[PDB]
Design an enzyme around this catalytic site. Sequence first.
Site, PDB file in Angstrom:
ATOM      1  N   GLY A 184       0.796  -1.215   0.000  1.00 26.36           N
ATOM      2  CA  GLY A 184       0.000   0.000   0.000  1.00 26.36           C
ATOM      3  C   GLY A 184       0.834   1.273   0.000  1.00 26.36           C
ATOM      4  O   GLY A 184       2.077   1.207  -0.082  1.00 26.36           O
ATOM      5  N   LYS A 185       0.146   2.423   0.107  1.00 26.42           N
ATOM      6  CA  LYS A 185       0.753   3.759   0.022  1.00 26.42           C
ATOM      7  C   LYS A 185       1.480   4.097   1.325  1.00 26.42           C
ATOM      8  O   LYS A 185       1.068   4.949   2.120  1.00 26.42           O
ATOM      9  CB  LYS A 185      -0.302   4.811  -0.306  1.00 26.42           C
ATOM     10  N   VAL A 186       2.616   3.430   1.521  1.00 28.46           N
ATOM     11  CA  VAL A 186       3.417   3.635   2.714  1.00 28.46           C
ATOM     12  C   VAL A 186       4.056   5.020   2.669  1.00 28.46           C
ATOM     13  O   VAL A 186       4.587   5.453   1.635  1.00 28.46           O
ATOM     14  CB  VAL A 186       4.465   2.516   2.834  1.00 28.46           C
ATOM     15  CG1 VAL A 186       5.273   2.402   1.547  1.00 28.46           C
ATOM     16  CG2 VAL A 186       5.370   2.757   4.020  1.00 28.46           C
TER      17      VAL A 186
ATOM     18  N   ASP B 195       2.863 -15.189   6.437  1.00 21.16           N
ATOM     19  CA  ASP B 195       3.620 -14.526   5.365  1.00 21.16           C
ATOM     20  C   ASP B 195       5.015 -14.106   5.844  1.00 21.16           C
ATOM     21  O   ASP B 195       5.477 -12.986   5.594  1.00 21.16           O
ATOM     22  CB  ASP B 195       2.839 -13.338   4.809  1.00 21.16           C
ATOM     23  CG  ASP B 195       3.316 -12.909   3.425  1.00 21.16           C
ATOM     24  OD1 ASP B 195       4.153 -13.627   2.808  1.00 21.16           O
ATOM     25  OD2 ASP B 195       2.848 -11.832   2.966  1.00 21.16           O
TER      26      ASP B 195
END
Length: 262
Positions: free
Chosen positions: A16-18, A125
């Site tokens: 995502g938009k880190v 994960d």
Amino acid sequence: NVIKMKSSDFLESAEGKVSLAFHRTQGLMIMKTVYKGPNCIEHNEALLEEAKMMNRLRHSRVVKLLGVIIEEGKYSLVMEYMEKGNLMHVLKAEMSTPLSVKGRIILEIIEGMAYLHGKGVIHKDLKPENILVDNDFHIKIADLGLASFKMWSKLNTLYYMAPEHLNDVNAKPTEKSDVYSFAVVLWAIFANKEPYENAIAEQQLIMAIKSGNRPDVDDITEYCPREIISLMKLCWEANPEARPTFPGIEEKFRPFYLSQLE
Ligand SMILES: CC(C)(C)C(=O)N1CCC[C@H]1c1cccc(F)c1
């Protein structure tokens, strides 16, 4: 134990938009904005519920959730900063790292996993991109793909996957699922690279792993102590019932680390 935060608490920066974000009161943080779009408050009951269950995860070797942002049009998780980045980034930097620092990084990964399985959290994960490193080469485990958090994940690497999850997606993951992933992380740490560098196709490759093919223990060019090579072979046995618990790994490796590398 409600930790909400406003978008305007934070001066941003890009990574995502880190996003690298200075909270005006508590300082430098990392902000995973999972969604910027139409107000969709149909889910907040649930996203606040997941955030509740991850606020429950506090350990020196886990990434801390420092706060959440739920506002009409923007939803964010805020994490602590980790100066040096993920584990692979470190391992691949030019000034490589002594066997004894690698020893501690391993022990610290062992610790963090034993904490998470204690809380009933299966990581699902575990891989070098989820292992983050600060200025003193201390690691914290993260779940950046949001693998344990279905609601956040929906809004938003077969190399480390236990084979019983390869070509089977309905099998529930177990603690032994993560132990396999730890085995290949041991490998990446000593190879200083991602495994299966020479592979034809990921359909070809998956069939190879299921049939017992593993990363190349010869490909380890640094010295890697025998007993750590044996550990990684033990942790990546095809039969999950034959891999150890992370409590069992630690009870073998902490003495070995204390008496051989620290
Ligand atoms: C980025 C987030 C915040 C999702 C993150 O990494 N979290 C949050 C709380 C603890 C930590 C974590 C670490 C390992 C496994 C796991 F499931 C969760």
